[PDB]
């Protein structure tokens, strides 16, 4: 049985929010560091019983669903809510089998034909990462969507805007101390908005900075990675060194 | 015993005027209705049901409100008589319809019928002189 992480957005301060991805980020890593920054474990070889973590989440209306989390991206595959359990369309028949362990005891299990990407989950959506708001009350109603889908309470569009919203204030937030930050200050002011470029390319970019920084000589990338700011305007990032304070976990390369 | 909605506040109303409904729910339902979404709709005869207002179940208060009402419409809560309201000014003919409150425990600010569990009864609203 998989570690379970809870999190409850009813009251929910700077420091629960906190303490909440911090533990995320320790059940996910255990660690293996290149050049200071954590590796995820990798996909190869690693047992079925130390593939998942699972984040169960209830709102002050006391509705719950619990996410399952792949320790090896961060990424969540599919939740739970009571009798009900939906996966992502997975990429190979590997994961396609790891993922009948998680909930094994669910009357009704369902696999979308779809995959949790952000292409795919903003076109269901019908709105990209930078109009949809994040926040406390966003992830507040995004448990409620959730728990509402099976009933055949909660439309299609509705369903993928609250993936989105979850997948960037625990999955994103767990791999980028900088988003972390970002969601704390939402919450903070208990005020919702739209991630901006500065974010919305650090989450398009993990993945090419994982490499880099596990490729990088010495902590020197091999070529230059392109982000934006807040306003737009490019910058590139040439070394880990920057990245110290930004990127808390990586995806296993080599 | 499910919540239940009753409606109050409709009736006719010259152009320019304002009407304020309310939404009030009965007691002893498990969980008040600050725990609620609340959304208003209306319906004219030839038309579908079409989503105008809503006021989330989160805490930061959300709201949203259609193009058609932005800036007249005002939708807010009285959590001491268990109510929300909906304030209409600024009122036209073409706002005639009946008009509906819905609610969802945990709800979002949602204009999708779908997207809601209770329904008041309805009351019209007639705006012409």
């Known amino acids: 049985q998989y570690p379970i992480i809870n999190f409850t957005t009813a009251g929910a301060t700077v420091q629960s929010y906190t303490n909440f991805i911090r533990a995320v980020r320790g059940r996910l890593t255990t660690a293996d560091v290149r050049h200071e920054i954590p590796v995820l474990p990798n996909r190869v070889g690693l047992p079925i019983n130390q593939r998942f973590i699972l984040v169960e989440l209830s709102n002050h209306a006391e509705l719950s669903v619990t996410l399952a989390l792949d320790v090896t991206n961060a990424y969540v595959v599919g939740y739970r809510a009571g009798n009900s359990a939906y996966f992502f369309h997975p990429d190979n028949q590997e994961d396609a089998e790891a993922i009948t362990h998680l909930f094994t005891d669910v009357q009704n299990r369902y696999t979308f034909a779809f995959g949790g990407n952000y292409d795919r989950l903003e076109q269901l959506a019908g709105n990209l990462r930078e109009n949809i708001e994040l926040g406390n009350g966003p992830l507040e109603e995004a448990i409620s969507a959730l728990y509402y889908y099976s009933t055949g309470g909660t439309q299609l569009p509705t369903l993928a805007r609250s993936f989105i919203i979850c997948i960037q204030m625990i999955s994103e937030a767990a791999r980028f101390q900088y988003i972390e930050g970002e969601m704390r200050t939402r919450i903070r002011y208990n005020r919702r908005s739209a991630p901006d470029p500065s974010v919305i390319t650090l989450e398009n970019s993990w993945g090419r900075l994982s490499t880099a920084i596990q490729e990088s000589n010495q902590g020197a990338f091999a070529s230059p990675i392109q982000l934006q700011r807040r306003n737009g305007s490019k910058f590139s990032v040439y070394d880990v060194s920057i990245l110290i304070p930004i990127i808390a976990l990586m995806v296993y390369r080599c | 015993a499910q919540v239940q909605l009753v409606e109050s506040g409709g009736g006719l109303v010259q152009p320019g005027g304002s009407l304020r409904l309310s939404c009030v729910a009965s007691?002893?339902?498990?969980?008040?209705?600050?725990?609620?979404?609340i959304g208003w709709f209306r319906q004219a005869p030839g038309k579908e049901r079409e989503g105008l207002s809503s006021?989330?179940?989160?805490?930061?208060?959300?709201?949203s409100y259609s193009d058609s009402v932005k800036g007249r419409f005002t939708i807010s809560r009285d959590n001491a008589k268990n109510t929300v309201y909906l304030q209409m000014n600024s009122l036209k003919p073409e706002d005639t319809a009946v008009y509906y409150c819905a609610a969802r425990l945990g709800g979002w600010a949602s204009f999708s019928p779908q997207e809601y569990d209770y329904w008041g009864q309805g009351t019209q609203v007639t705006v012409s002189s």
């Open positions: 006021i989330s179940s989160s805490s930061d208060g959300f709201t």
């Open positions: 007691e002893f339902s498990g969980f008040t209705l600050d725990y609620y979404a």
